Design a protein around this ligand. Sequence first.
Ligand SMILES: [Zn+2]
Ligand SMILES: [Zn+2]
Ligand SMILES: [Zn+2]
Length: 585
Amino acid sequence: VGACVLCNSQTSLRCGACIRRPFLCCKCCYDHVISTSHKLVLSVNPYVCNAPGCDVTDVTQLYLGGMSYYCKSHKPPISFPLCANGQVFGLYKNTCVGSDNVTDFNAIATCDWTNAGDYILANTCTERLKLFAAETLKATEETFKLSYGIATVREVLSDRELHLSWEVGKPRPPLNRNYVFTGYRVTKNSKVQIGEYTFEKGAVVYRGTTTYKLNVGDYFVLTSHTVMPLSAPTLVPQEHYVRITGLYPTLNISDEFSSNVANYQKVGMQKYSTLQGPPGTGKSHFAIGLALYYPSARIVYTACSHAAVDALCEKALKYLPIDKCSRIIPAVECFDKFKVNSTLEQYVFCTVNALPETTADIVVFDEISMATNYDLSVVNARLRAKHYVYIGDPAQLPAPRTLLTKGTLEPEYFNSVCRLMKTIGPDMFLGTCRRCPAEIVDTVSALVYDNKLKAHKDKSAQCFKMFYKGVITHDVSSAINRPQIGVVREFLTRNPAWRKAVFISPYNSQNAVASKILGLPTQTVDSSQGSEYDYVIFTQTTETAHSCNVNRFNVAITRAKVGILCIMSDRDLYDKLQFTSLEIP
Ligand SMILES: [Zn+2]
Ligand SMILES: [Zn+2]
Ligand SMILES: [Zn+2]
């Protein structure tokens, strides 16, 4: 028994075929079953033929006879079919409304999540259907990680490097840091965890959580976690106020935060507010400062990643009483300078999925482009606040959608919050970049921020761009462009100063070749989001939808404090770089 995800109508019927078993009222259960392949129907029992060794599970071919379900064949003299009168049989038959359309629910219940148009629906549908989609997608995502075969240690060539043997008759996952494994050791009658790991082509390169002397027989699987059903919406209902509510502003603020005094007051005058922070516009400065502006205010700082939550803690550690902070951790090595798991503490820094049920004066959700609607509904479920602030930049990278292959995902579709910022604008905007030379700012200002991003720094005169297609080899699930790494080898010799630079590319295999040949440190664009370096050497590697995505391109070039070389495959972005052009040697 539960609530029809379409009507809210009370009902005893869940679709069995749906991987998430939504409650469907007699009306909506029927409209669903007769318009799709989904025909299994669960109640206080499962609508299946109780007859001995009959296989009938379709509800359009079944009948209640006595108190037991039968198909045409086995039914007793006296029965009625489970499925007629535009309705499927179960409790609460007289309270049951229906819906004009069920089209969106069928699409969501049935889509394989490989087309972008799927995720577009999950983010424009009714809010109840945004929750059902969020679950159905996340459960599809965790199911797909099972389709992958087991990796097993066949030899230990060295430390940091291994020989893996793979389970037969199953696909092998990509070996980049978007695929985190879990290890296992072969015990008398079962198996025990031995840390989380990632792998990269060599033999394979493994970067484990802990260290060990892991030996042959030890194996690896992408550990999947049960997706709990969702209840809270992705956003609370918005309220706009005429005075600051529930918060007491400080009378003396420092000049370090004086620029955010207006925006912090806005936060006090609406239920939730959205802050776009472009690269190095000072989001965490904003987040921590809000505390000092509302000194008595209880604030729970959250993001999806440990990394994100830890950076909030690192800034907190500068400005806020340590004795007033606490980091929440469930039973990976994060920040460890705050008393651990003290929920009643004034400032609580915690990932989404480890949040405790609790209230708070303000909730700050950071790095909001990386959040799914699923995370969005967890935060609303776990934290009842007077005020919610969503901080991020819908021009930076979303969560990877492992299943997605047909179409690109536009920022207005990353989650409900980024939909808002792209369709009615963001409530607040950090509009001065402190990090990058002006050439890089001028470029992303135009590219993705409507000429509203302003450069604190001057031109560096150290931002260069080369058009060089080079040669694109492909391996198992990445790209390589050695001639582009070639160009950069040649550049470093004439420009030795740039031997301090980080190497950034949209591919881990490009990154691996580049480390061997240049011995620069490497980040993929995805792994660089959040970090800053003085000098950056970016090889686009390909002209793919991946390598040309304007959000990835935006994060790639905004890592530089001083100077950047961009070796470019794409004429389009090449032509949009406000950088000094260089000929090819
Ligand atoms: Zn219904
Ligand atoms: Zn279904
Ligand atoms: Zn039967």
